[model samples]
Target: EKIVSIGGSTTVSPILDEMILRYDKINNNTKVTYDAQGSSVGINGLFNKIYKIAISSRDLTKEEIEQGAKETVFAYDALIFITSPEIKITNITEENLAKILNGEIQNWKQVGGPDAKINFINRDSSSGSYSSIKDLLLNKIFKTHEEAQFRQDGIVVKSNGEVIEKTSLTPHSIGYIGLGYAKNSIEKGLNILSVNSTYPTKETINSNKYTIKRNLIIVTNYEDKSVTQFIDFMTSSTGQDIVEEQGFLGIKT
Candidate 1:
């Protein structure tokens, strides 16, 4: 009861931290720690009894929950690609996304942009955000992306936040991340790229403009009413405000 750990979906980590701080204001005796790891890694660790709480940007598979996990829904998260602000265009199609991210389309002009060559930034497989987007657009072999490569190719990133940070520093680079991370990048010259001619914002996500959207999920083994209380608080009116403040869409009406 002294330590509670949250792993997975770095996008959710900061939100959880904010929630924990407010929760602790009422229950000062407990100590909670949240760790940011790739979504799959966090789930695997939770299943193996490595952590107490797991946060993910997408729903848990039925198979994983069958192994003894209690899940809670928070909100919806939209995955958006980011590029250097100096780049001319901020919109792209799913076809071009696959091509650029996978390395097939090398030049910016190939995708209706400046003449500069497209520098693809890859997300690690462990990232839930990346996983969700991959499932939505390029569920198959991603044949359109035969040329894209990363230093950690075929592997997922540790966290979407980390991937965003990486994309921000390297000019002419591109990467995908959660809306929360994008807020941070927006202040640092990160341009949110459109997908399939549609922008991804709270309105876009809610109205289905953003095709690549996912419901956020968290899993725990505890069968306590307190867990549900916290979950409810997160999805409640007060809870959703915090989510909105972080530059993400809230689920509840």
Candidate 2:
């Protein structure tokens, strides 16, 4: 009897769901289950022996990988910073991005958008996507104005879907999430902003033009030969056909 469980990065769940369905059709007997617990929790879950395989957005720290687990890059994920349906300010630089998430820009009119007040949304500390974006957009070296910080006024959502729902309904609110969440609302009122015109589109990400890219890692141990095949399939041309459609960047062909 064999079981495969994928845990990590909520944004990765949709694509993995697709893959699992596709994989299951061909390999009937095996049971596959997946969960999105954010990046850090995903890897930590592996350590906790809760899951055998992890779908993390960041690689395990050197110390973590050294502890009998192997992690490999399978794809690249980009965090899409978005806002309410009525908000339409485009081209946010890394500098302003931090401010918006940190609680700096409190008014929609401040950023050339509507005159409504600005609301901020963030993810739980357990997420790797937030961790990476936080480091890139909120580390000490990165400056944050008083208004741009995401503090008491910020709404922290637990899942990618929830982020979209919250931002979609909340007036003049701002939030960031993975492309998977935006795949549906790209056309409607959802305002997906560009990071200085560097959109998080699949083309931009695939071409290495998107700046907010991070490795999508899978951690495994012991049964690596079979596990490695999954990686090979993931990074392979056929796998990427699915990956790109999943709102992620594929390895260069």
Candidate 3:
């Protein structure tokens, strides 16, 4: 039997889990295992030869491209701002969001919400979500700056699950996560906020109406035949069905 290890991007692992199960059932000779770490770890694992496949939520850097790393986008996801149910505000403008994240706005009341200090929950730099926020929102708002940065004062979390947990338990807190976490977040009493009046739906995200959307991808530098086969299966109609079932938009359909 051939054993394959895939790692990186917890955001993409849920869908990968389903895909692996189905793939393994069809191809009994192959056994695949997935490690659900952050996107950075996955890419590093690929370069280090620790993982046969690396799942990434954000695009690869030029440095990685220069090193011969290649990426295949199989699905799409939206980065959504979420708040605890205590915050009455449902929609936020990009300007206000930039202010909130940059420490310019410190209180919920400043953004037409309840009277409470805003507890901003942020992902660490290792996360692709963090990079997405930096590229999509922070950079866009602070175009004059050399590099826009998130507020240093807010709490920093490692994964989307942690973000969901913290945002649900912390009153008047705001955090960002991929759209895959939306259903679980809602069940945890976290409200998904619309950015600039446009909610992150499949239609909006696919059409680029939701500005914070990102492609969920798999990366590799190796030319393993099994890896190539797995990627082809993931881009197939059956694999895309699994992607849609897992709450991400399939690239194939």
Candidate 4:
């Protein structure tokens, strides 16, 4: 079987890379390809039947559900607030996060940090990360084009890795990414923050104490057994082991 996995959660594909290699080695009849496009593209690709599976960081919208796409929650991740190591502010409340992203708070000193301009980095409109943040903090009813146009003032990066790159190398910059991305970057000295004084850990996220969490899913037509088998392995104990190895919270908990 030949399959392709595409998405917003491409930040986690590093783990997928390892998983696919191991699966192919053991199964011998399967080959997997991953596309790193944002979530919207992945959904469209699935709807259009270009890919066997779609990887999304958030739940599918109503319209997407009507189109016959099904999602299986295999893992969980938090939409973490991250900044460069040079940034001193370590924790933030939802109000302050909204304020910073809204462009109301333009300097670090306003939030008890050094006097420096705050460079707000964000994901583009097509990203699940962008939609999740906007939905979580800015607007409950998200309008993609409208919000994209509205957030033009902030620096937008196309991928999670790029967002981490920009925030890690720049001074006084703030951005958000999935927990897996934040965890990987943390090993390289990136700084992640507590939201509303609640930090996201395996315990906090598993216990529902972390408010910024999102579900990770596999969207499929379910018409192919090979594809289903792959997903089965992904959520299986062995597969979830890979999820944990990649620094994401497994669904088994």
Number of the top TM-score candidate: 3
Q: Which segments of model 1 are wrong by more than 4 Å?
A: 1-11, 24-38, 41-53, 65-72, 75-79, 82-91, 108-192, 207-215, 220-223, 244-249
Give me the displacement of residue 78 in model 4, in angstroms: 3.3
TM-score of each: 0.59, 0.61, 0.64, 0.62
Clashing residue pairs found in predicted model 1: 102-148, 103-148, 124-156, 124-157, 125-155, 125-156, 126-156
lDDT of 4: 0.77
Over the stretch 48-147, how does candidate 3's per-residue lDDT look in tens digits?
9899889987778999999889988788877889998978899999888988888889998887778899999999988778988887788879865643
RMSD of 2: 5.7
- Per-residue lDDT of model 2, residues 1-253, tens digit only: 3666668888678777777777665565556678987878877888888877888776577878687778766688777887776676777777667666665667767777678877788788787667767765676324434433346657888877778888888887777787776775564468888886798866677666786777777787556344544556566676777887876767665
Residue lDDT tens for model 1, 144-213: 4433333333324577776667777766777777776766778777888878788887777777778767
List lDDT for all candidates, in order: 0.70, 0.72, 0.85, 0.77
lDDT of 2 at 75: 82
lDDT of 1 at 160: 73
| lDDT pick, better of 1 and 4 | 4
**Cα error, candidate 2, residue 90 (Å):** 1.8
User: Candidate 2, after superposition: displacement of residue 50 in Å?
Assistant: 19
Question: How should the candidates be ordered by TM-score, best one leading?
Answer: 3, 4, 2, 1
Candidate 3, superposed: residue stretches over 4 Å from native? 1-74, 144-147, 216-236, 242-247
Pairs with backbone N, CA or C atoms under 3 Å apart (clashes), candidate 3: none
Cα deviation at 203, candidate 4, in Å, is: 3.0
Model 4 is weakest, by summed lDDT over 10 consecutive residues, at: 141-150
